Amino acid sequence: HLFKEAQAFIENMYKECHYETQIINKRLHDIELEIKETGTYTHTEEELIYGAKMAWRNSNRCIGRLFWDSLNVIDARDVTDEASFLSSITYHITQATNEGKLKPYITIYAPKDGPKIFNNQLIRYAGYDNCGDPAEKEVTRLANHLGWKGKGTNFDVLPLIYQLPNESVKFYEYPTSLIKEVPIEHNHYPKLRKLNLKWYAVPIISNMDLKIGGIVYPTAPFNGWYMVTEIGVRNFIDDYRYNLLEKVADAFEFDTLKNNSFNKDRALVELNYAVYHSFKKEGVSIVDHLTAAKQFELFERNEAQQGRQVTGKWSWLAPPLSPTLTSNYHHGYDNTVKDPNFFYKK
Amino acid sequence: HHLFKEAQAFIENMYKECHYETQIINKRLHDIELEIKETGTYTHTEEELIYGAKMAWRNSNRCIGRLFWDSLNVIDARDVTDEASFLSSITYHITQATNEGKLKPYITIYAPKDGPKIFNNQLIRYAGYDNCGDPAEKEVTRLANHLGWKGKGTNFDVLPLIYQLPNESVKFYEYPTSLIKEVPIEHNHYPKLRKLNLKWYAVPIISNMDLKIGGIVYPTAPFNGWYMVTEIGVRNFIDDYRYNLLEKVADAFEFDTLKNNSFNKDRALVELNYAVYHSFKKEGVSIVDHLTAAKQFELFERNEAQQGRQVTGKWSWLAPPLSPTLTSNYHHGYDNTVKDPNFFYKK
Ligand code: HEM
Ligand code: HEM
Ligand SMILES: OC[C@H]1O[C@@](CO)(O[C@H]2O[C@H](CO)[C@@H](O)[C@H](O)[C@H]2O)[C@@H](O)[C@@H]1O
Ligand SMILES: OC[C@H]1O[C@@](CO)(O[C@H]2O[C@H](CO)[C@@H](O)[C@H](O)[C@H]2O)[C@@H](O)[C@@H]1O
């Protein structure tokens, strides 16, 4: 079964790379071998780089796949000592941030006996009883249990929580200078700044499994740049998250929030307008929900031109703001999940 | 036989819900089994027809307004076979449904075999032309024109009923003006919007679906409820394959630009729904906003739990096309199993 998934991957990659049937066979030969010698096989560095790009390209729930081939992949399968591991994490965050103009990065670690990461994202705000991000409560209790103690504000950057093989779980705090943050303000509603809201620049998912032709990489944090509604609608407004609708509505001076007023709806638009332009002011990359969809159309065009069909999960590709104003809203998608890809941990 | 299976499942589900003794159910199943052998199908007890229609609305996975299923006003018109009575029954439904603005949910079920045939998508819809009107009603408008119907050629020409009684040509019938309640759209804060001369009808009456109850298919059974703001303010007015009014409306709201990062497109959308909502309110026509409708759906789920029934649904349709994250249904999935009785699109 392993060789079967492996074969599938090699064929697709090489066919897409216009490789002579000849070498394809040689490669399958080499693989079939070490699968017997070992139990699994090892991807060439070209396959690892191409496999991760393909995984992003098959990520059905991703609206930003237009830039899939832009991924900067880092082979860290050899990282086994604490110093180099930590060094690789900070390097990723530093190179991804790129002084504001974010760059797609993925740091792939060893598929077996490798560094384990417990964070949902390399960068997240703690979640406490009376403040913080409710979604990060679990990971925050773990941090505290380990000995970590944050300032206790609404935006305490959680530390990297990791564990090397044959060692206990540890946590590492990033120097604040490493994490770029964006104060949120509205150039038409002075009172918004008074709420002291802000968000980090780079979203680095570190709790998913990367699968390339049979091999499963349990640790391979990756990042892109935000799309307004992620911060302005879900992070800040979801009732199970920061749930700031009321405080923000006040900053916008809406005397009421009765459903009849449609102020709840106006507050959402304004908040995303503030988030977007606050990021723009800090020189940090961000894309608005509608532009993000236009870029997605191009992705679809670029794929059809390469003879590939487009898969996707409708409910995710559609933004939580003026969804009908996006092309993808008006038709369905084939949610078929292909390999390579990213999956949730069991 | 296949028919009896479905009739039985319906009878059992229904009578069980009404707490009817086992003997009552078995007696009914006998009578049904009997008349299927003697005639091909069976006839629904008037009670079964009324409760069956309500179970159909309650099982409709795509409907956010199911909290009111219990209140459906069912009209049995399986006896109507002549034209004059057919039309009369239509104006009656429209009359009762509208109720001068205090809209009431109604459904008229005609004969399941050899009954009146209806071609409209909704009893009330605006004509669709090549240079104006509702693009969605092009096909139906072509038919109306072919039959000799001729409208003033505006963006809002109320189409005529198009029907056909057995062994008779397809005809069209124009509703009296007084019969069709309409609402002019205007925004209190934006006087320029009135200048667009927009409006919409009060009652949404679906007339293009099949009602299925215990194996019995009722092809002609128009139903209605009242509108939820986004159906008009977002889809009907803004979809590019509908009236496509974003640019025009934006100008009425005086937006200097519609470039994406300006977010005016989104403000324009919220403002247009605010207009549509209060316009209906000003004219005294029932309407519910998207968020309020979703709150009522929460109640529906609470009531259904208390009745031992599970709730099915189609997520993408339940989530409104405006600030969907502000509705509870957006944050979890829904079992889209289609149970009977139910409504179906005509094949
Ligand atoms: C370049 C900028 C990018 C943009 C703007 C973009 C945008 C998005 C958005 C809006 C989501 C929805 C998140 C949510 O609301 O839950 C998402 C999900 C996703 N994206 Fe992208 N993306 C980008 C880069 C990346 C990269 C680099 C990868 C892969 C290496 C990727 C993989 C995915 C995956 C796996 C999901 C689903 C994750 C989940 O299940 O929660 N994205 N992306
Ligand atoms: C009493 C007020 C009601 C409200 C506010 C309500 C609201 C809605 C909404 C918002 C939709 C989606 C429309 C669209 O986007 O195309 C819908 C669909 C639906 N509703 Fe309701 N509804 C009501 C009454 C009814 C009644 C009385 C019935 C059944 C006898 C019903 C049957 C359905 C069905 C079958 C659909 C799907 C129709 C389609 O496929 O286009 N609804 N309703
Ligand atoms: O936009 C992509 C999305 O559209 C659907 C709608 O059914 O299919 C269309 O696009 C495909 C290309 O990805 C074509 O293969 C297909 O023929 C066309 O109808 C979805 O299947 C697809 O996910
Ligand atoms: O809300 C209905 C919807 O919820 C799901 C999961 O999203 O089912 C869970 O919640 C129901 C509460 O209404 C329970 O009856 C059900 O047992 C539970 O699993 C869907 O399956 C359902 O469509």
What is the CATH first-level class name of the largest domain in chain A? Alpha Beta
Which structural class fits the helix and strand makeup of chain A? alpha+beta
| Percent range for β-strand residues of chain A | 5-15%
CATH topology-level name of the largest domain in chain A: Nitric Oxide Synthase, Chain A, domain 1
Radius of gyration of chain A: 22 Å
Strand order of the largest sheet of chain A: 1-2-11-8
Order of helices and strands of chain A: HHHEHEEHEEEEEEEEHHHHHE
Task: Name the hetero compounds present.
Answer: protoporphyrin IX containing FE, a molecule of 2 linked components (GLC-FRU)
The most extensive contact between chains is:
A-B, 33 and 29 residues
The CATH architecture of the largest domain in chain A would be Alpha-Beta Complex
The main pleated sheet of chain A reads as: 4 strands, mixed
Helices and strands in order:
Two copies of one chain form a homodimer.
Chain A: H1 2-16, H2 21-37, H3 45-57, E1 72-76, H4 82-97, E2 105-109, E3 116-117, H5 137-146, E4 160-163, E5 170-172, E6 181-183, E7 198-200, E8 204-205, E9 208-212, E10 215-217, E11 222-223, H6 229-237, H7 245-251, H8 263-281, H9 289-304, H10 314-317, E12 341-344
Parallel strand pairs in A: 1-2
Antiparallel strand pairs in A: 2-11, 3-4, 4-5, 6-7, 8-11, 9-10, 9-12
Helix pairs in contact in A: 1-2, 6-8
The structure holds protoporphyrin IX containing FE (2 copies) and a molecule of 2 linked components (GLC-FRU) (2 copies).
One protoporphyrin IX containing FE (HEM) binds next to strand 11 and helix 6 of chain A.
GO molecular function (chain A): heme binding; metal ion binding; nitric-oxide synthase activity
Catalytic activity (chain A): 3 reduced [flavodoxin] + 2 L-arginine + 4 O2 = 3 oxidized [flavodoxin] + 2 L-citrulline + 2 nitric oxide + 4 H2O + 5 H(+)
Keywords (chain A): Heme, Iron, Metal-binding, Oxidoreductase
